[PDB]
Amino acid sequence: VQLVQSGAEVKKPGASVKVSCKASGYIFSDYNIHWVRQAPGQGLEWMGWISPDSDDTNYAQSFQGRVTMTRDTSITTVYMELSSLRSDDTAVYFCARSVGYCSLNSCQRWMWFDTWGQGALVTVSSASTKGPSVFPLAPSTAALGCLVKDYFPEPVTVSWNSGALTSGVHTFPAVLQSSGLYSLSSVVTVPSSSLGTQTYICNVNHKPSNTKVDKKVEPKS
Amino acid sequence: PVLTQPPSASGPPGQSVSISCSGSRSNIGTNFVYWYQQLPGAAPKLLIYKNDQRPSGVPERFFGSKSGTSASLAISGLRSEDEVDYYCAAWDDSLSGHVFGAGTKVTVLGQPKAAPSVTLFPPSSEELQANKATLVCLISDFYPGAVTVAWKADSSPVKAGVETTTPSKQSNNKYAASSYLSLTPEQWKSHRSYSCQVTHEGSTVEKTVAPTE
Amino acid sequence: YSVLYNFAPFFAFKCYGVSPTKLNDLCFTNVYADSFVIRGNEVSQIAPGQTGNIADYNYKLPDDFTGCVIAWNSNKLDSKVGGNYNYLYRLFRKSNLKPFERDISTEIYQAGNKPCNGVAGFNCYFPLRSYGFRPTYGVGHQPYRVVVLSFELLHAPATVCGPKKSTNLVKNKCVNFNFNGLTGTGVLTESNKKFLPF
Question: Other CB atoms closer than 10 Å to residue B140's CB: what's the count?
């Protein structure tokens, strides 16, 4: 069934976002939809379920007013609100489809999570939308690489000679700053005798920023 | 009532081993314990429900069992294709929610040691015009990860705006760690020798690169 | 009682006492109505002086009840093609459930000498189970909406009375009238008298 997700953007704390999981492909009155968050550095958390025919829910003793769950039966689409994103909210709110009605508390013991599909990914950070301002790099077997700074959010792509050369490019983890910015520097292996005789250009594309930059790298002259 | 689950599991292939996920009073035993799994970068699936019958679509290798407060997961044979992230799920009447532990990571009990390769790339002359200066050097060809990095100005150690992170697994079964240092243009031109150093079994590699290149 | 002869046919309309159509003639003190859903094979297990496995561990109707059960078949929000774990039943109870009594327990029930008071295993199970209320199953697995009418007599002044019909006006022709239990024979004419509202 169509368990696809709705895309969401990064937002600074102090606002609310709209997260939607598609509930089509099956009848809405008999299958329950569950939401489980997977947060790094801690265990998973489950806050509560819904009855997808009327107003009926129960809240666990972890979340009280941060998460609101609604339901629509006319077009069979559910909308959720996440407010005050923080370190605790940094998780992937997966969409879990299961059998069962579950208007009571003893139903959950005999019920198992049937199918998980297309969990929406939510990034919690004060940083929102900004454009890269990358300057050319001066390098000094040998290795050549180009960096990216003051860009948000993830991810970005890199290419050497417009993607005509492959040298095993691997992504790297970055460090969160106080303001919040990632730092990626893809470094490839090049011969030591080929530094200026062969051209080498670096292309960085920012999909949320809708910008393309193509700056070469050369030693200082 | 928080589920206690070990972070890493030392499971040797070819022999059976049982891991324990224990909870608390009125958390395991009043309600059943459920076993699930999820692949990194993929949707979760169902492994074992009710600890009685094995569901269809899953090979009959993991045994669903529960004995007392401790919940025992029994396996029969280990495969490289079945290194999925298992998880411990239970229902609590005193919490009205599903309780999850830390989660087990299973690593097969590899790679030869190699000399690290560190390349320092100073910023060009166009970075100082915008009053922005950063220095990035990459650490690779090392196994395993969890390495530390220091920055040397060849006069005294400095601890200000250091950026380090846990290295991630490579596609070629390797490890790579990236180091960063955010500074000011006043400090960038203060010294003529900036470098980054690491530790690797008591061995270090240090090279001097001038800011003027 | 006009809304008690519709809403789907009643699987078991036969009573064990006063006739349902004669309840309009007699006024009753208080009525007890219970709302729950049972399986299609659990309809026959409830009877005066008779019980089944599920009925002995659940609500039981004794020989002296002053009333009977009226149950029907309806599938609008009672049957689920997926799971139905809200509705449960008792199949391992401490003793026989006496009539006009109820009990709730979400904690496990032991079956041996070891006290299972927080831990379980092979020898300890759970006293409740969920129905197979699925439309793909048979007739005896279908849910049934069940209500039992219970009456208590000679304990309070009667206020739950049956419906009394009404007729049309008559004028200047003596009839055999009846006004709120007052019987008599005579003409009905317009009156010039004045009463008080009581």
Answer: 21
